[PDB]
Amino acid sequence: TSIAIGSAEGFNQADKAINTAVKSGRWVMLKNVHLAPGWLMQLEKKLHSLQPHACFRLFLTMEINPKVPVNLLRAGRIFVFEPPPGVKANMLRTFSSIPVSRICKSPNERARLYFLLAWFHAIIQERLRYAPLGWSKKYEFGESD
Amino acid sequence: YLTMTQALEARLGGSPFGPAGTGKTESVKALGHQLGRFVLVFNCDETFDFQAMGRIFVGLCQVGAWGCFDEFNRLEERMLSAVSQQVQCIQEALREHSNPNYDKTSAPITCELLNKQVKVSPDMAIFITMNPGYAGRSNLPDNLKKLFRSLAMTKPDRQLIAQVMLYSQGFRTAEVLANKIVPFFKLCDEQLSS
Amino acid sequence: IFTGSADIKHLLPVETQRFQSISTEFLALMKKVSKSPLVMDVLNIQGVQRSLERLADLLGKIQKALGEYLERERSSFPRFYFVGDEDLLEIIGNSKNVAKLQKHFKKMFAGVSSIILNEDNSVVLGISSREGEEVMFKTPVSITE
Amino acid sequence: SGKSMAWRVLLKALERLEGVEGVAHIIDPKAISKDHLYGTLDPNTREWTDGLFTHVLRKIIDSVRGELQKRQWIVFDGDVDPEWVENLNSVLDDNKLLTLPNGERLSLPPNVRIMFEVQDLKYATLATVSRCGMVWFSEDVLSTDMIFNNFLARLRSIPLDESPMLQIQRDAATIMQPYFTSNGLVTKALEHAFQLEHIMDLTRLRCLGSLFSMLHQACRNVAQYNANHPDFPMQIEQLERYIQRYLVYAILWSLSGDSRLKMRAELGEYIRRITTVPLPTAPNIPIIDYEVSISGEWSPWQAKVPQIEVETHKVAAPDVVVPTLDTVRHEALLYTWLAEHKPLVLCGPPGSGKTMTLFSALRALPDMEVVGLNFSSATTPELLLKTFDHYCEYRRTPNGVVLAPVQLGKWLVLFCDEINLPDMDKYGTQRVISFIRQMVEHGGFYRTSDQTWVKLERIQFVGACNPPTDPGRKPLSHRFLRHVPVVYVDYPGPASLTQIYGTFNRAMLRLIPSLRTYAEPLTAAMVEFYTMSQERFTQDTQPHYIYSPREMTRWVRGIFEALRPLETLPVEGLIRIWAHEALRLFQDRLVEDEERRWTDENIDTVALKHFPNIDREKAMSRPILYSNWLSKDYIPVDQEELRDYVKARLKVFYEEELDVPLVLFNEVLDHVLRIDRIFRQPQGHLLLIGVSGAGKTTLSRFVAWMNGLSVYQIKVHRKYTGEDFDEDLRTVLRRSGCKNEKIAFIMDESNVLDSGFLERMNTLLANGEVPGLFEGDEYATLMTQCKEGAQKEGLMLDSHEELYKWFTSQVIRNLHVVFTMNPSSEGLKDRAATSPALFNRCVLNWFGDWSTEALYQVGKEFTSKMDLEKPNYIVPDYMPVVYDKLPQPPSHREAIVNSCVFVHQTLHQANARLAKRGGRTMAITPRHYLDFINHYANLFHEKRSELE
Amino acid sequence: SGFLERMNTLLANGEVPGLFEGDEYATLMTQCKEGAQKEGLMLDSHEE
Amino acid sequence: YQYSLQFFLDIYHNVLYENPNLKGVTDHTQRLSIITKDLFQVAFNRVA
Amino acid sequence: FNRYPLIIDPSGQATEFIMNEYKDRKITRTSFLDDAFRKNLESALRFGNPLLVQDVESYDPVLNPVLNREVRRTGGRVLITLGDQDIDLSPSFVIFLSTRDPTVEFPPDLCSRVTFVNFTVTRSSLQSQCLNEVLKAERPDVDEK
Numbered sequence A: 001t002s003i004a005i006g007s008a009e010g011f012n013q014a015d016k017a018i019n020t021a022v023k024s025g026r027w028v029m030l031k032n033v034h035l036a037p038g039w040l041m042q043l044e045k046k047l048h049s050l051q052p053h054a055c056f057r058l059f060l061t062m063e064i065n066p067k068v069p070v071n072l073l074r075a076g077r078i079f080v081f082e083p084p085p086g087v088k089a090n091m092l093r094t095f096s097s098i099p100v101s102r103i104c105k106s107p108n109e110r111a112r113l114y115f116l117l118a119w120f121h122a123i124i125q126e127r128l129r130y131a132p133l134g135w136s137k138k139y140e141f142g143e144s145d
Numbered sequence B: 001y002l003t004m005t006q007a008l009e010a011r012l013g014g015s016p017f018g019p020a021g022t023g024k025t026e027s028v029k030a031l032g033h034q035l036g037r038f039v040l041v042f043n044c045d046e047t048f049d050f051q052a053m054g055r056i057f058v059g060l061c062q063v064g065a066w067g068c069f070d071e072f073n074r075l076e077e078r079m080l081s082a083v084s085q086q087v088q089c090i091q092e093a094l095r096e097h098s099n100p101n102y103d104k105t106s107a108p109i110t111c112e113l114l115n116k117q118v119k120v121s122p123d124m125a126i127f128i129t130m131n132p133g134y135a136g137r138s139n140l141p142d143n144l145k146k147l148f149r150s151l152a153m154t155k156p157d158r159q160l161i162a163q164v165m166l167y168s169q170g171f172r173t174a175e176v177l178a179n180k181i182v183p184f185f186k187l188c189d190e191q192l193s194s
Numbered sequence C: 001i002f003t004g005s006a007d008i009k010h011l012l013p014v015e016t017q018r019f020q021s022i023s024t025e026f027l028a029l030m031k032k033v034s035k036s037p038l039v040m041d042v043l044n045i046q047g048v049q050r051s052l053e054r055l056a057d058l059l060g061k062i063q064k065a066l067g068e069y070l071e072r073e074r075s076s077f078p079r080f081y082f083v084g085d086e087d088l089l090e091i092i093g094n095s096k097n098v099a100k101l102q103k104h105f106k107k108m109f110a111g112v113s114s115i116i117l118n119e120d121n122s123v124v125l126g127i128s129s130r131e132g133e134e135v136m137f138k139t140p141v142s143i144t145e
Numbered sequence D: 001s002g003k004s005m006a007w008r009v010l011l012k013a014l015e016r017l018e019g020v021e022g023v024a025h026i027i028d029p030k031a032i033s034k035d036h037l038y039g040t041l042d043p044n045t046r047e048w049t050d051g052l053f054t055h056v057l058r059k060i061i062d063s064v065r066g067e068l069q070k071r072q073w074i075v076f077d078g079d080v081d082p083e084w085v086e087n088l089n090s091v092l093d094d095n096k097l098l099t100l101p102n103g104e105r106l107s108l109p110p111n112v113r114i115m116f117e118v119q120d121l122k123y124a125t126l127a128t129v130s131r132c133g134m135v136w137f138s139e140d141v142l143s144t145d146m147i148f149n150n151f152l153a154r155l156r157s158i159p160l161d162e163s164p165m166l167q168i169q170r171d172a173a174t175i176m177q178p179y180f181t182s183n184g185l186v187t188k189a190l191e192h193a194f195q196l197e198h199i200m201d202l203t204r205l206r207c208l209g210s211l212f213s214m215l216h217q218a219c220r221n222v223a224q225y226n227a228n229h230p231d232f233p234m235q236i237e238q239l240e241r242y243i244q245r246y247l248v249y250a251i252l253w254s255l256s257g258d259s260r261l262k263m264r265a266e267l268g269e270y271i272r273r274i275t276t277v278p279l280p281t282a283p284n285i286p287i288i289d290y291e292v293s294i295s296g297e298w299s300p301w302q303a304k305v306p307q308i309e310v311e312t313h314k315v316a317a318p319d320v321v322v323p324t325l326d327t328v329r330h331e332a333l334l335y336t337w338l339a340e341h342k343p344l345v346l347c348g349p350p351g352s353g354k355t356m357t358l359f360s361a362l363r364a365l366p367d368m369e370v371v372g373l374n375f376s377s378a379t380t381p382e383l384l385l386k387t388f389d390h391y392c393e394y395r396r397t398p399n400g401v402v403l404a405p406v407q408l409g410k411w412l413v414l415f416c417d418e419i420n421l422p423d424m425d426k427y428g429t430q431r432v433i434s435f436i437r438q439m440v441e442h443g444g445f446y447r448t449s450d451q452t453w454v455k456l457e458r459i460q461f462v463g464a465c466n467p468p469t470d471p472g473r474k475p476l477s478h479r480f481l482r483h484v485p486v487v488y489v490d491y492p493g494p495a496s497l498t499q500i501y502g503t504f505n506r507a508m509l510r511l512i513p514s515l516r517t518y519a520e521p522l523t524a525a526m527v528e529f530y531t532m533s534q535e536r537f538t539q540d541t542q543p544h545y546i547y548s549p550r551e552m553t554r555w556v557r558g559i560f561e562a563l564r565p566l567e568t569l570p571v572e573g574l575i576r577i578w579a580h581e582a583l584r585l586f587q588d589r590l591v592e593d594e595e596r597r598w599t600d601e602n603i604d605t606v607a608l609k610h611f612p613n614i615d616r617e618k619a620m621s622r623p624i625l626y627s628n629w630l631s632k633d634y635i636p637v638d639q640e641e642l643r644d645y646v647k648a649r650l651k652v653f654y655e656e657e658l659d660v661p662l663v664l665f666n667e668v669l670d671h672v673l674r675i676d677r678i679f680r681q682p683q684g685h686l687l688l689i690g691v692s693g694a695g696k697t698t699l700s701r702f703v704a705w706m707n708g709l710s711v712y713q714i715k716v717h718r719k720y721t722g723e724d725f726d727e728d729l730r731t732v733l734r735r736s737g738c739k740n741e742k743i744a745f746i747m748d749e750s751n752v753l754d755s756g757f758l759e760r761m762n763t764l765l766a767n768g769e770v771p772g773l774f775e776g777d778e779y780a781t782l783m784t785q786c787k788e789g790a791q792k793e794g795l796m797l798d799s800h801e802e803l804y805k806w807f808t809s810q811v812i813r814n815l816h817v818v819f820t821m822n823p824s825s826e827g828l829k830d831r832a833a834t835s836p837a838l839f840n841r842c843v844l845n846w847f848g849d850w851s852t853e854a855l856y857q858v859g860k861e862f863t864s865k866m867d868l869e870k871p872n873y874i875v876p877d878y879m880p881v882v883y884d885k886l887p888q889p890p891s892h893r894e895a896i897v898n899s900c901v902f903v904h905q906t907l908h909q910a911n912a913r914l915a916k917r918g919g920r921t922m923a924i925t926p927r928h929y930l931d932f933i934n935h936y937a938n939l940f941h942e943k944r945s946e947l948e
Numbered sequence E: 001s002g003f004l005e006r007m008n009t010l011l012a013n014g015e016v017p018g019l020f021e022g023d024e025y026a027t028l029m030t031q032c033k034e035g036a037q038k039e040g041l042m043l044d045s046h047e048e
Numbered sequence F: 001y002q003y004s005l006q007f008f009l010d011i012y013h014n015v016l017y018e019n020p021n022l023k024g025v026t027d028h029t030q031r032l033s034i035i036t037k038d039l040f041q042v043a044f045n046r047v048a
Numbered sequence G: 001f002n003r004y005p006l007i008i009d010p011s012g013q014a015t016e017f018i019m020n021e022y023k024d025r026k027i028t029r030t031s032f033l034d035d036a037f038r039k040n041l042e043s044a045l046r047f048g049n050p051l052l053v054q055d056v057e058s059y060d061p062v063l064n065p066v067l068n069r070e071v072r073r074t075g076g077r078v079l080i081t082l083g084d085q086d087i088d089l090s091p092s093f094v095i096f097l098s099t100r101d102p103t104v105e106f107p108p109d110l111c112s113r114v115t116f117v118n119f120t121v122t123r124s125s126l127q128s129q130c131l132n133e134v135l136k137a138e139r140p141d142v143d144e145k
């Protein structure tokens, strides 16, 4: 159950989804939770006093922001997503993201094309680390492109 | 046109961005008129809360019209994040409309907008127009930006526009007139007092 | 609204009785006016100005109570979603007299500014834009049907 | 620059030329909230309510009364910022649409024009500027000659009364015509006046408006002179003399009335250099000291400042004004300005006498009643709306809605005390200022309840303000200043202060004839001390270091109150009371010790210098304490007798009201005396600033119980809202005004959960009355209880106006507010502007933290039960002394107490070190010290018993 | 006997005509307004 | 970079009990060396 | 303690220690956020039972008279003003405020009204815990002995 945070009905949906999933064991995901730090505080307090199902999981997607309460940061485990360190890591991530079935399609050339694409992608984002020289500004060349 | 049609084919939205007066809203309206679509322009602001946007989307999906939301970034960041869910639901409804196995003899495609099932016409589309150069404007969350294909609309071709407008209005010397008026506007911009 | 519709009586009963009372008072006053149509003779009718003010207040109060009915009517015809509450009430009430609807089409259509009708105002021959351009339907639409 | 007149003229000309009726809707976009301008969508009901612009446009579109056949011009007369104007982006674009959040789309009719009349576009974005046709009106477009011609034409054509008076106006205009020419007297004076420096930015139209109003008053004066002399109507020669002299006088008082005395003198010298009008022949006296007699001759103002002898029972009274040169000049100027119903501004340092001067000039106008408003940083047009609701009434006339005072034949004057405090938006706009300007210029405003234009009638505005360079003061809009002339009220000079307070001290000391010979030195000493204080403690150090003639008035009033019951008193007693009042007024607000020591020494030196041949020790023994607890007169009290009396009273207090034991020490006695001084004064509110846990609340409750005041505290919880605070305010006001119950309303800064709380408190402290607190059924119940009360004390009062006035008087007399906060710096600076009354109507007491002496006394008294007796104690060679007044051969007990004080101070230093290292610190309070000594006593007793 | 008169009137009609008056009447009108609004029945004039 | 003590204790428990490098190792000192190396490695991985 | 303690224990061991210490005296656990906090607090005041209140960073000012011990002894009664009502204080009442966030900053009044008890993690304690854990995991017989 994926929910975008930012509205009161969104908060109600998040509360209901968590309440049903802690019993049923499904996964709950809340995006952009950095936009309501107080509600994050009460959410962490509610999470502390729970004995949920074994398979229950809660994902909180946030952008790196000081307004995030440190109580929630200590309560949970943090994973940082950012540009891959280098060309090799970028290409590895790109190849991991694409399913093997998609790349291995009946036109045998397709894979090579994908490889080329990956390389090109892994180039341009890398040039973003050199802001004045690689480009003229920090374009948002991301996974959607 | 190329970028917007590419976005439409993938059932995504369009996001032309650039400074004011570059022809973004007018370009979107012109593209909608080229395809014979009913295009509605909305001057968004902070009072466009979640239920208002949901009602607008319900109306657009039922009628099958185009929604050109100009100054999209004037909404609150939390509110943009909230609207992203409705945008994603609408795009998924359009995508399952685009599938081959389904035919118009089956049940109509519906999406869950405002806790109700609403039919989605295939002609409906969503376009957002913004200029990220203003200070104080909200920043679109990434989960919402990935739902739109963006395009920089920064420098309109003033010379060609002037030439064609003067030619179509009956000016016999339209070429020289445009070639004199466009540089004159440039000189007026960067020669007079600021 | 309350005479050309059936479900409104079952769904808004309080509004139905109150509007019936208001209509009774309005018809009584208008009959008194019709007996002697002299503007002065109307003027010196005792307690008429405050009666009209009360009538206006009550009618305005009733208008604010038709939100759900208007929402359902919008659900009936999608383009009504781009029509305000008072304009939608005017359209639905004056559906019999289509002459007053010509000013409301610009809100519902891209280029349609008025419809073309025969002398009986019973059959829709075609449409017209704001600049006078006209489109004639190949098969006309019958309002009576 | 002639913009408004230009578009009005164009509208009228188009209407006459084309036969199309022109209708213009003037809207001030920034005078109302954007929700009130464009509309609201109810989050619960989802029902759309139109704003002002939306309602106007929708009414034009509907064309029920044929608005589509007219030429409609919607003029946005106000500041433009990208918050409200961007919602017009579709309106100003080729879409020509207004798109509302509810999905409604309004098409702009072809006959509607959207116009903006603005003075600048320094905040408007490019998307907004590019969408509109620009017309730039330079200031040179409207020449000064144009304004002069308009003024003269109106003077010759329009009667000022509502014809002999028209003849007066025409004759005056004929006399004034030579001076109202290019390069003439007025233009030269104007171009020179821009070279001078003023308390506010000078504009041509403000000066011209002040001059025109004063000239109209001159014509009215001529009319009155003719009326009072029917046998001989005033002739041409005397008329010419009078008009020329009055014109030069009005030029002087307009073009330099908002500047220092030096700039007025410079303008007078320049005018005398350039003009040809006859002038006073004094060698060095500047022209500004001469008024213009109705006979047509220069007359010194000094003739109208007689040396008066105030009544002995009315010394330092609020309504008593000692005439002074500046006093009479400013009073005449204010009378002239108010008589024309022209709004005005009193600018000057706080306590200079702006409010006093305005009220004194208001005495000469009996048809005119004043209502006080105290603007704050959170002040919005809602305050003005509440005041209009209370004192005015909306009546419907065939021309529209008219808002007028309920009391017929009288002019209501809204004296707003803090014009320049309201928070300026980040686009350089004060909402209440724009709203006031909308009333002043257009004679009305918009009711947002139904978006209806309401015209003011018989309503006048007077503003007060400190100079805009002061902290928390914002410069007023230029477009607002063009309607309101500004007059600078500066602090009285040493000579004027000497005169006024010598008169007061004479009328005071006439009670004791033996002291009558000491009036001249006493006053001088006062002034001298005050002078040094004003130049020693500036606002640059602390926000509350503001000394004004209010301090001198309080000094005189306190000395009079002390000397009132006494039958005889030596010079030593008078000196002691003088020093005591000086300490209570100048040393209570001091923050750290060096300033208090400086004040003590300087009072010593001033008393010695201005009062020689007196016993220094008899009149100035350092523990100066006065009380009326051990007697019936406010006489000096011994420290030990006071300590025993307070101990007995506290023993009663513990059993009766609050069972919390207290440790007595000298600062507690001083503090309870200070609180008792204020609980005995009318409208006496306290502001206690000190560390939490220092006993401010407990001492306040103890003193209130001593004085019989009922202690009231609001019970704040998590879900406390503004409505709960309003309910508590209504309860306390009902108890304090309808039942004649003296109440001590004690409140802490922690109780303030919203700026609305501070706004309500500001209004209540300043006026003793919240305008919008009682309304509806609460108001009716309030009048009921007020009537029962008024008939209970035998007052025959039935109508609502005087019942409410009596209720306000009862609240003023019976309610005392105690405010407690911690001694923060940024917080104090913020509150200095957020609630100005907290520093103007509240007596400030800086309790601070417990001093080292206070800690030592507390420890010594508390550990008296503990043994701490070691006869063979060996004093170390280097005793680490902490209490500097500790005996040098200390006992074991004294060493123990010194160690305890050192422990407290080393915790202070440890927290200082953690704060410096970037760590997190928790404040150390005297409650920590009390816990430490309590644990010490308990552990000592336990361990001794166990060992034994 | 006034107690019995008031009780008789209240029992027979459900309302005592002279019980609410003055400020009590205005307060009753306000509470009646808010109670009718809470129920979902909109009323503004005193008689209804 | 806000980490609780429970996070470090979970790291320690994983190194002690859920360590894949202690399949058949039975020597106490060898197990201790493996535990130390895996503690450093797992702490770095989880924190990083 | 002389003033009622405020406990700062991120690990939560201090709360367990307090509950076990006062278990025989019927200690109950509540929170400032709980809607039953008021009734639980007044019950503890009246019956003199130990009370443990968590989430002190959401402090309710209603405890201000209780923390300051503003008791009034009249007519043989010891009264505490809990909000707007007087309650017969029992001499055996005791309260413990707790929090799990060491980074919270309290206003000076609250810091004055309570005595702080910080349950920080020391190097010696951590070394002891880790040594015991490794001994139990790798040398179960030795740890059990």
Ligand SMILES: Nc1ncnc2c1ncn2[C@@H]1O[C@H](COP(=O)(O)OP(=O)(O)OP(=O)(O)O)[C@@H](O)[C@H]1O
Binding pocket: D001, D002, D003, D004, D005, D006, D117, D118, D119, D137, D142, D146, D147, D149, D150, D205, D478, D479, D482
């Ligand atoms: N053509 C004119 N002839 C004579 N007097 C004029 C003329 N135009 C304006 N005035 C006068 O000069 C003054 C200018 O006022 P006006 O309302 O025109 O200013 P504005 O440009 O709109 O200024 P603001 O932005 O401060 O409102 C007024 O006293 C007005 O009566």
Ligand SMILES: Nc1ncnc2c1ncn2[C@@H]1O[C@H](COP(=O)(O)OP(=O)(O)O)[C@@H](O)[C@H]1O
Binding pocket: B018, B019, B020, B021, B022, B023, B024, B025, B026, B027, B129, B156, B161, D093, D094
């Ligand atoms: N390709 C074009 N041909 C003709 N006119 C154009 C073109 N592009 C822009 N314009 C004109 O420029 C003006 C401003 O464009 P607009 O839609 O306001 O852009 P933006 O969305 O950046 O504000 C419009 O009036 C439009 O008619």
Ligand SMILES: Nc1ncnc2c1ncn2[C@@H]1O[C@H](COP(=O)(O)OP(=O)(O)O)[C@@H](O)[C@H]1O
Binding pocket: D316, D320, D321, D322, D323, D324, D327, D348, D349, D350, D351, D352, D353, D354, D355, D356, D357, D464, D492, D500, D549, D550, D553
């Ligand atoms: N000429 C004077 N005669 C009598 N009192 C004066 C005179 N000048 C100043 N004062 C004293 O100065 C004080 C002025 O305070 P106020 O008018 O409230 O200042 P402001 O208007 O700046 O707030 C009064 O209390 C008054 O006693």
Ligand SMILES: Nc1ncnc2c1ncn2[C@@H]1O[C@H](COP(=O)(O)OP(=O)(O)O)[C@@H](O)[C@H]1O
Binding pocket: D660, D661, D662, D663, D664, D668, D691, D692, D693, D694, D695, D696, D697, D698, D699, D820, D927, D930, G068, G069
């Ligand atoms: N002089 C004193 N002797 C003993 N205790 C004191 C003294 N002053 C304050 N206290 C303690 O302070 C507590 C009340 O503090 P309070 O006055 O509410 O702090 P604040 O001054 O910040 O309002 C009481 O419980 C009392 O024990």
Ligand SMILES: [Mg+2]
Binding pocket: B024, B025, B026, B070, B129
């Ligand atoms: Mg645009």
Ligand SMILES: [Mg+2]
Binding pocket: D003, D004, D005, D117
């Ligand atoms: Mg103007």
